[PDB]
Amino acid sequence: SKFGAISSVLNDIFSRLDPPEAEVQIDRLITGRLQSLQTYVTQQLIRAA
Amino acid sequence: SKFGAISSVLNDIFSRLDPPEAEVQIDRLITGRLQSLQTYVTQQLIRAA
Amino acid sequence: NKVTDLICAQKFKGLTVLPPLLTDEMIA
Amino acid sequence: DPLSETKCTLKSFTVEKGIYQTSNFRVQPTESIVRFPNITNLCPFDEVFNATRFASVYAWNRKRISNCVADYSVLYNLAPFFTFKCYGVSPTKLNDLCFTNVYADSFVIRGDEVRQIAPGQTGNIADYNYKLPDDFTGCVIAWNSNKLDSKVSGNYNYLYRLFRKSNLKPFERDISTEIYQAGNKPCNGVAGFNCYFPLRSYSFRPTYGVGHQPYRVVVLSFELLHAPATVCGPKKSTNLVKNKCVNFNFNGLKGTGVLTESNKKFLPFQQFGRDIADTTDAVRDPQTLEILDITPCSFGGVSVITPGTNTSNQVAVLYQGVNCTEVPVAIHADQLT
Amino acid sequence: QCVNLTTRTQLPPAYTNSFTRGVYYPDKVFRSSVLHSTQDLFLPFFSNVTWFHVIKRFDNPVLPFNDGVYFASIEKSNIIRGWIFGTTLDSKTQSLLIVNNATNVVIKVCEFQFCNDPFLDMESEFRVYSSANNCTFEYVSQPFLNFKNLREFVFKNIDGYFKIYSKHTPIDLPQGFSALEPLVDLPIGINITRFQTLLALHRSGWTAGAAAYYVGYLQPRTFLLKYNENGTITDAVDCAL
Ligand SMILES: *[C@@H]1O[C@H](CO)[C@@H](O)[C@H](O)[C@H]1NC(C)=O
Ligand SMILES: *[C@@H]1O[C@H](CO)[C@@H](O)[C@H](O)[C@H]1NC(C)=O
Ligand SMILES: *[C@@H]1O[C@H](CO)[C@@H](O)[C@H](O)[C@H]1NC(C)=O
Ligand SMILES: *[C@@H]1O[C@H](CO)[C@@H](O)[C@H](O)[C@H]1NC(C)=O
Ligand SMILES: *[C@@H]1O[C@H](CO)[C@@H](O)[C@H](O)[C@H]1NC(C)=O
Ligand SMILES: *[C@@H]1O[C@H](CO)[C@@H](O)[C@H](O)[C@H]1NC(C)=O
Ligand SMILES: *[C@@H]1O[C@H](CO)[C@@H](O)[C@H](O)[C@H]1NC(C)=O
Ligand SMILES: *[C@@H]1O[C@H](CO)[C@@H](O)[C@H](O)[C@H]1NC(C)=O
């Protein structure tokens, strides 16, 4: 999932874009993926109960 | 934590950057700290159960 | 006895603790 | 009154019997203090911008600026600087604060390639002459000096490196003039097939267009760090105030709290302190080497005990976590309740 | 020019074990009753270090400067005087020199006409300062000062700052813990590769005692320092041991 970025493959962001602008796009990917993991843990705790 | 911001101090960011451009920095810290508060309450609700 | 600054540091960030309504004397 | 605050919080015009946690009280500051070093000597910005002739780009000049006052109103004295780009700080009157060390790098380049003095750029300048770190913090000042440097017949005073095996690390200066060999045959110090001289001259001419006029660039690098600050902005100090909820500005550290005497065993090299939460708890006075504690002003929670509004309009107020000797009694409009 | 001590006899260096040494204060912040994790250049725990005995035995070699050096010397009668640093260790280009007087300390960074073995020494024949061409930074302040004295020094050259940490404790490396408080910081912004220590021999054809100094190298490692009350580092843990 791109989360609104140009591409999901993080190699493409580091190549096509400049390092000042890539970091902004990369920051979006981590923040989305951190939430996706965080949602999964919460679902697991509810099921485990 | 910094959450991608230049600094983890609110006073430093406001005393160093113009209000035009300081918004894109404070937003990361406010949203990031809102996630930390929301996560804690969700875990607290599960434990109370 | 078997079951048992950091508190002051937490209080300054907005984290506080409310005391229970029933004291230990009432529960005993 | 407390009852109306309950109604405004519940978003209702009738309130049932119970206890409601309405808001939090806190003491407002009374005055403001500023503490800065007492030095009065100014920084040598004159020589950096008023140099007769600048250095080459491949061998740029580096200057150490320290133990002075850096007033930036001086820079509005010469011709308008057509480019004032800052990273990590805004130039519009937000440059009056304390830095630790200042590096001044000056060189001369062409106008079309002025956009190469920036983080994350490519080109002959970026990786062969002058590279900036990815986390750069400072300002770059570019102005036109076509009237002075450029000449009708071309001057060879300024040269730039064209051939180099590998990119330059940020803030690395290379003055090597060795022949750039790129073939099997040896170069023996002379040019030829795959043998190159890295140095080439601009040969500025006034008849050239906009993209070829020479431009003078001065790059300022700061370092905002916990270490004691040498260079600081032109700001006025204030007498020390203790045992009062006041604002404070200790060498750029802005905050609100109470300053009192401390028993901290500050070793001579240690400037300030921190608590477990990684926030400032103690500070050293810049003008008298005094150790002061920072404590936030009084705060707490307020609850309102109300019977039903259909019964009575009287309320009781519970200040949570207060010993009743520090319950705030001041009236002169200094309470956020 | 100086005397070429041709009688110098080479012997293989010995290796000892530094148990828990080289822990210093990586920041100016004051902390107390906390456990803080720091990533910096440290001396790895239980790492063997070269041991150069002196006096006879005359071991004053040129040694590389691999990102930082931990230097120790457990001797009496203040046998050790100072150190010299640079990239080519000659008069061709820049070099840094530190010398302690009997009451003072002098630092000079410029081109010295280094001979094969610079040395120190009633007192006379002061050829020690043979020539200074053009020197930029100078610094003079209060002096740095079984056997009784033990001296530890950490030299690190990063970010244009040359940092020296030191400790003197009353007393084959002894047991215990001692953090090295920051002493002196000189901005030179220079690039350094090799180094060599200097000492003095008391002329009568001289009568000098024995000496022993150790050399160790820093590495990037993560340490868990324990700050007690009063802000003193009492323990440390090497996470990668
Ligand atoms: C700082 O400078 C002021 C001059 O305005 C002087 O009166 C004061 O004594 C100085 N501070 C110290 C500690 O000497
Ligand atoms: C440079 O010299 C000129 C002429 O005297 C004048 O603008 C000023 O003295 C200097 N400018 C700066 C910015 O120092
Ligand atoms: C509250 O104030 C009283 C009166 O000054 C004092 O004796 C007491 O120690 C304070 N604290 C508590 C917890 O009662
Ligand atoms: C002998 O000493 C002189 C000056 O001290 C020096 O120039 C020369 O290189 C030395 N010779 C040897 C073989 O070390
Ligand atoms: C001493 O030096 C190395 C350093 O890595 C150490 O690991 C080893 O045990 C020793 N080696 C020799 C040759 O003594
Ligand atoms: C070092 O300083 C001491 C004390 O001033 C002096 O007696 C001695 O001559 C100095 N050594 C030199 C200048 O080599
Ligand atoms: C000094 O520069 C040389 C250049 O070859 C390099 O090898 C060395 O690592 C540098 N010194 C330090 C302490 O990094
Ligand atoms: C801290 O310092 C005080 C006075 O300087 C001393 O009484 C106390 O023992 C010290 N704490 C230690 C050494 O742990």
Strand ranges inside E110-150, DSSP E: 138-141
Residue closest via CA to ligand 8's atom 3 equals: E230
CB E99 within 8 A of CB E81: yes
CB D171 within 8 A of CB D131: yes
Q: Do D94 and B16 touch (CB under 8 A)?
A: yes
D253 - beta bridge partners? D250
CA distance D142 to D85: 9
CA distance D312 to E34: 53
CB under 8 Å to D17, separation ≥6 — which residues?
D306, D307, D308, D311
Main-chain phi, psi angles of D264, to 5 degrees: -65, 130
Helix (H, G, I), strand (E, B) or coil at B31: helix
Question: Does the Cβ of E143 fall within 6 Å of ligand 6?
Answer: no
Q: Which two tokens stand for residue A28?
A: 């979006």
What torsion do the CA atoms of E5, E11, E17, E20 make, to the nearest 10 degrees? 10
Q: Around Cβ D223, how many Cβ atoms within 10 Å? A: 14
Ligand 4 atom closest to the CA of E115, numbered from 1: 5
Residue closest via CA to ligand 6's atom 7 equals: E102
The secondary structure of residue E132, as a DSSP letter, is: B
Q: Do E29 and D270 touch (CB under 8 A)?
A: yes
Q: Is D243 left (phi over 0), alpha (psi -120 to 50) or beta?
A: left
Closest of D270, D333, D284 to residue D37, by C-alpha: D284
Q: Do A21 and D120 touch (CB under 8 A)?
A: yes
Cβ-defined contacts of D4-12 (< 8 Å, 24+): D5/D304, D6/D304, D6/D306, D6/D315
CA distance E51 to E59: 10
CA distance D166 to D65: 31
| Identity at E224, one-letter amino acid code | L
What torsion do the CA atoms of E181, E186, E189, E190 make, to the nearest 10 degrees? -90
The secondary structure of residue E107, as a DSSP letter, is: E
Question: Does the Cβ of D266 fall within 6 Å of ligand 2?
Answer: no
CA distance D227 to D230: 9
Angle between helices A19-48 and B19-48 (to 10 degrees): 20
Closest of D71, D224, D264 to residue D137, by C-alpha: D224
| Mutation pick for ligand 5 pocket among E16, E17, E48 (CB with most ligand atoms within 8 Å) | E48
Name the neighbours of A, counting chains with at least 3 Cβ pairs within 8 A.
B, D
Domain ranges of chain E: 14-241
Q: How was this structure determined?
A: cryo-EM
In the block, tokens 């800052």 appear at D86
CB under 8 Å to D94, separation ≥6 — which residues?
B15, B16, B17, B18
Q: What's the order of all strands across the beta sheet hosting E80-86?
A: E63-64, E194-199, E80-86, E95-100, E105-109, E138-141
User: In Å, how far is C18's CA from the nearest CA of chain D?
Assistant: 9
**Nearest residue in C to D274, CA atom:** C9
Closest of D19, D182, D171 to residue D105, by C-alpha: D171
In the block, tokens 């003193």 appear at E232
What torsion do the CA atoms of D204, D205, D210, D215 make, to the nearest 10 degrees? 40
**Nearest residue in D to C12, CA atom:** D296
| Mutation pick for ligand 1 pocket among D287, D288, D289, D290 (CB with most ligand atoms within 8 Å) | D287
Residue E112 buriedness (CB in 10 A; 0-12 / 13-18 / 19+): buried
Question: Does the Cβ of E127 fall within 6 Å of ligand 6?
Answer: no
CA distance D8 to D25: 16
CA distance D321 to D317: 13
**CATH number belonging to domain E14-241:** 2.60.120.960
Cα of E153 to ligand 6 centre, how many Å? Answer: 23
Q: What's the order of all strands across the beta sheet hosting D61-65?
A: D61-65, D102-110, D214-221, D138-144, D83-87
Question: Does the Cβ of D321 fall within 6 Å of ligand 3?
Answer: no
Q: Which two tokens stand for residue B13?
A: 């960011």
Cβ-defined contacts of D90-94 (< 8 Å, 24+): D90/B16, D90/B17, D90/B18, D90/B21, D91/D139, D92/B18, D94/B15, D94/B16, D94/B17, D94/B18
Gaps after residue numbers in chain E (C–N over 2.5 angstroms): 55, 121, 145, 171, 204
User: In Å, how far is E28's CA from the nearest CA of chain D?
Assistant: 5
User: Chains D vs E: touching, with 3+ CB pairs under 8 Å?
Assistant: yes
Residue B13 buriedness (CB in 10 A; 0-12 / 13-18 / 19+): middle
Chain A residues in contact with B4 (beta carbon < 8 A)? 27
